[PDB]
């Protein structure tokens, strides 16, 4: 069903700071072309969109897009089917969707001058990085090479252009400032559940260690593993015997231990190889990254936690990509998220 | 104040844009990170589109098109969290599209692996950016004559300055032709519709209408650039400082300009635009001459048989509006005047 009944909806900005240019502002002088003189710039703020059902039940859900993405990925699939925003408002949760600082409606910190530069200060780097379609195809495990699909794929074929059009670059905002914005949002919302994806996986783990209001985490294919400082286990290189996964993030154990106090689930899709795949770099990367996450969850459980890894094929769902929540079976993926929320009492008031 | 909204459906999609390519071939066995332009296809200049459809809509869908440096947020909520025009017009039984144009918000910002906007030797957009300060925006938007000051009658949601200015940012140097192209494609996709524009999207919406007969009406909140038939720009005075000018008017071929005479067009202006020259307040004076230029543009449309009008909100009994009347404290009354325009032309009936 596509129908939704909203008690209220809207959006707002939260977080960020200001930076200032030199000199003072004279309203009698030409304002355009724009100048840094006398300037205050608001930078690194985050965009937040909320939709609240009638008679909400349980905690609000905060959906946090992966790297180079926006809240669009929770609104609709590339072929136009309802995304998790609609599905979970229908499931009677208030739903927040964010565009983190540096992405989408979040702030991209640039001024009058070379990109990211405020006079002599580099706020973000002028040189950007950004995946190609080809790199994203293999990262997302549509298939082993660009243009090729795994036979079992749940990707909405024929909507490749729509899908890749949602992706873009991120400026070099410090991860600390991204975590800060979401901590401030969590303080504003109250008790809530973070639903993260890829790059926002590690960021959501960090937010939870700073914000007792985070009462649970579901992370779709997190990209960076997290461990207590000085307790990173041995992680092998890739099958090329040259490359490594993303360097695991290390946090003080007193913060890491907060992860044991809430239910945490990492969700993985299909077509991650069991054995080394030297011919397919990103397939092998996912093999080792998933392994690293298994050790991270184990470390949480050894501190008394309740941290689990859900492989969708074990639940009977075959062919999911790195975006299970926009795949053809995303309704079934959503049902498994509702199951997690229900078991942990996160769907009751 | 009235917050409930009932949607038959909602969602979002990407439309428009093109692809550009890097050199060489992509090898899936080589490290994919750090990202490389080698063998790369990049989708650039695409537009983000959100839609919310009421149950049993009445009349044409509305396409709300944010001003310069903005996003669809400005139609979703006001800075103090009151309902924006998206909610108000779904409640008014129109399907509502809100866009983030190419280069803004969820639209594409075309950059790659290299200095901003550069794909190897090709400059897609400039590496040097421009962006208003808070102070520049304060005076541009006519909150008051100088930063920190408010006009006596102001409808701005005072106290929410941080929320308001946080919504604004830079735009890369995407060609206006490609922004117009994306919206033409959207209008082809949705069918007959009304464009509701603001500031920088004023002139872009006029251009879209000349390329898309599905545009059945335009309401433009304080358009920033005037439009005239080629070679027929009237005399427009410089500003009171004797050296500055308004934005150079856009000139289009007469056969395209004439298409603007076939649909109802309304330009809406807020308050505190001076009648006489103001050399001490550059943006106030800029708005005086810009509004004058638009009055001449509308007259040119009407002399060709058009249905063009200028609504000064104070004349309608609304005092104190800023450059964003649709997020001001009286935005419900502003919305009522938009509903009036739609009703007058049957754009609220099936």
Author numbering:
A (entry chain A): 12 to 360
B (entry chain B): 11 to 360
Authors' own words:
SulE, an esterase, which detoxifies a variety of sulfonylurea herbicides through de-esterification, provides an attractive approach to remove environmental sulfonylurea herbicides and develop herbicide-tolerant crops. SulE catalyzes the de-esterification of a variety of sulfonylurea herbicides, such as MM, BM, SM, TM, TrM, EM, and CE, to the corresponding herbicidal-inactive parent acid. The structures show that SulE is a dimer with a lid loop in a domain-swapped β-hairpin covering the active site from the opposing monomer. SulE shows a similar catalytic triad consisting of Ser209, His333, and Glu232 at its active site.
SulE was overexpressed in E. coli BL21 (DE3), purified, and crystallized in a space group P21. The asymmetric unit contains two monomers. For each monomer, residues 12–360 are clearly defined based on the electron densities. The catalytic domain is a typical α/β hydrolase fold, with eight β-strands (β1 to β8), six α-helices (α1 to α6) and two 310-helices (η1 and η2). The cap domain (residues 113–184) is inserted in the loop connecting β4 and α2 and is composed of two α-helices (αCAP1 and αCAP2). His333 Nε2 is hydrogen bonded to Ser209 Oγ at a distance of 2.79 Å, and is responsible for the activation of the nucleophile Ser209.
